[PDB]
Q: What sequence folds into this?
């Protein structure tokens, strides 16, 4: 609703972000070709997703700062920092698509699959990460929350990389890992790989920008936001397989990649010993017929209906956590975000 | 000399660095497997090089801080920050070896070529980068130079990535780029990809730790150190091809990878029109016979002797820059480093 509202406004600011990041081109002409590559990287990889994280920073900021303190420069810093969380996302996805052997992202061929790009996209991804701290320095360097924001982005990156490491370790190519795909492990993976940077980070950044820096306040927000991020990753796994690629913009790879998906964890909890064999013989391999076999098993087990029920119960639980932990922050802060992702198809 | 001295001391501290980075394992057992992977990454990828950058931080620190201000904690911070520049190096090399299709590094198979690793090494490389800011926070957070060090590492990373981008852009696979391999372009590539992080960064970090933060002082040091780093990269290119892989620990790939190497730039300046054709038909391709053809051309052109002369003249020039710009810093600071790299065979 409020997200829907701010969406055109937020995307319109992207041209300024690009302009400012590429403005070193007059002062140091010797790096002109690299800066033209950076602009190409930014245009391809920072546009076309939902902008949920960047929008959350902007919306939260507006709801947390007294309107009389929202002058032009303040607002600009807020949307700049929203764009930083978007650049973080861009960095992670570019690299992740290489590591997951993915084909499409946000409705187009993955950056690394473009002819002429390939593993150069590794450097590209890191340049996106570098842009975050260039923007923080250009816009927020004089603010009392500058160090807090730097440390929050760096810590958020580390936690996300640790998540990514548990993701890759639980999914060896070439090895059947069924014994490792447990509820407990799944929760640990998604807490680190998705929830810190996609839920806690944007709200925490707007909190620090609003001068809300207390540990108790951050720990309360974190309780809501981490559970929100677990739920969002369960949706992401559901969408990898049962989503429409023309709506989600991406082709699924979790089964081929041997991933500890929410779907395989649920499959294992309900599997007969015979169906367990079907999973063991078919999971984590590149053959289309083996992937289809696993999908048919999930459908045979009513997993889409089980996903609908989990989502209702978990949404109710997040709503209870908001009732417990939102204060003294406006509940709308957390609700706008829950409503943006409840029942999402992309 | 002084580097030779501090080398066993510096390497001995690596076990503490590992211990402290892996100490989150008692508090959050859920990330234990990721932290065991991080230790494996650190042990494989942070050990076995020359430790020139880490040692430079330690040596410079000792020479810049009054001995009476060098207490146990101070020294520990200094070697910790030396280890940060080593982790930066580890991050860059792991990723670079993927992008360059390299085989060996520091005397062993490149991390990404280890069976079971492959493109997971992308996440590994970034975890190494994350460790830098974890160590800065654990050891330097209360110091007046904390922000300065954070911003120096982040800026140094960005400049190095911009260098890497000019390197990749000047070396397209599958395309003959001979027209782009100019003196001017070469100097711009190596200034950004090597000189800022390998020469300016360690000395600048020890300067900031010694409370030397003035812009004029940093700009003078930079003049010496950037020229030093250009010269060091010219040596690196010379070693890619004419070095002993059992001494350098790495197999060369510049000719196969179509790189704007110092050697190809020199080859082009002296080539007859016929030899230019030999280069055009043979450079930037994977065939062993084509690589050998290019090497024979370089040897036919006395390029090893031309490298010896350039090195003498450039070393003399760096020495002149030290005479002009060292003050008020001890010249030994820059000389120890020049002497560590003059005439190096690895
Ligand atoms: C350094 C870089 C390799 O680190 C990361 C890169 C990407 C990610 C990450 C986190 C959460 N989601 C994704 N992508 C999703 P997605 O491909 O969009 O479905 P996942 O592959 O987890 O299902 C990537 C985490 C860390
Ligand atoms: C994000 C990551 C991809 O960025 C970088 C990674 C590595 C480098 C870099 C800088 C200087 N030297 C190297 N390696 C050398 P080397 O392989 O050791 O001979 P080069 O391939 O330039 O000849 C790598 C620069 C940036
Ligand atoms: Mg993934
Ligand atoms: Mg993925
Ligand atoms: Mg997914
Ligand atoms: Mg390279
Ligand atoms: Mg290389
Ligand atoms: Mg080299």
A:
């Amino acid at each position: 609703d409020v997200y829907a509202q701010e969406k055109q406004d937020f995307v319109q600011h992207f041209s300024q972000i690009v302009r400012v990041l590429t403005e070193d081109e007059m002062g140091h002409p010797e790096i002109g070709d690299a800066i033209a590559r950076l602009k190409e990287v930014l245009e391809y990889n920072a546009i076309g997703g939902k902008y949920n994280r960047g929008l959350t920073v902007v919306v939260a900021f507006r709801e947390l700062v007294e309107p009389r303190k929202q002058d032009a420069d303040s607002l600009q810093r807020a949307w700049t920092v929203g764009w930083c969380v978007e650049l973080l996302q861009a960095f992670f996805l570019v690299a992740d698509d290489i590591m997951d052997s993915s084909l499409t992202r946000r409705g187009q061929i993955c950056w690394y699959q473009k002819p002429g790009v390939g593993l150069d996209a590794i450097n590209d991804a890191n340049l996106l990460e570098a842009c975050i701290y260039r923007l923080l320095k250009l816009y927020c360097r004089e603010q009392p929350y500058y160090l807090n924001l730097i440390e929050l982005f760096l810590q958020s990156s580390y936690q996300t990389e640790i998540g990514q490491t548990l993701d890759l370790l639980t999914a060896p190519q070439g090895n059947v890992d069924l014994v490792r795909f447990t509820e407990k492990r799944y929760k640990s993976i998604v807490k680190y790989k998705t929830a810190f940077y996609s839920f806690y980070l944007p709200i925490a950044a707007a909190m620090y920008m609003a001068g809300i820096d207390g540990e108790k306040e951050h720990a309360n927000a974190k309780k809501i936001l981490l559970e929100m991020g677990e739920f969002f990753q369960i949706q992401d796994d559901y969408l990898d397989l049962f989503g429409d690629p023309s709506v989600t913009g991406k082709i699924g790879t979790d089964i081929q990649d041997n991933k500890c998906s929410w779907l395989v964890v649920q499959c294992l909890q309900r599997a007969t010993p015979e169906q367990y064999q079907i999973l063991k013989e078919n999971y984590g391999q590149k053959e289309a017929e083996k992937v289809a076999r696993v999908k048919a098993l999930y459908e045979e087990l009513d997993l889409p209906a089980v996903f609908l029920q989990y989502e209702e119960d978990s949404y109710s639980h997040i709503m209870a956590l908001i009732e417990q932990y939102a204060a003294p922050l406006p509940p709308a802060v957390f609700l706008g975000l829950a409503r943006k992702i409840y029942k999402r198809r992309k």
Residues 245 and 251 of chain B are 6 Å apart (CA to CA). The first strand of chain B starts at residue 104 and ends at 105. The domain at 1-346 of chain B is CATH 1.10.600.10 (Farnesyl Diphosphate Synthase). Residues 72-99 of chain B form the longest helix (28 residues).
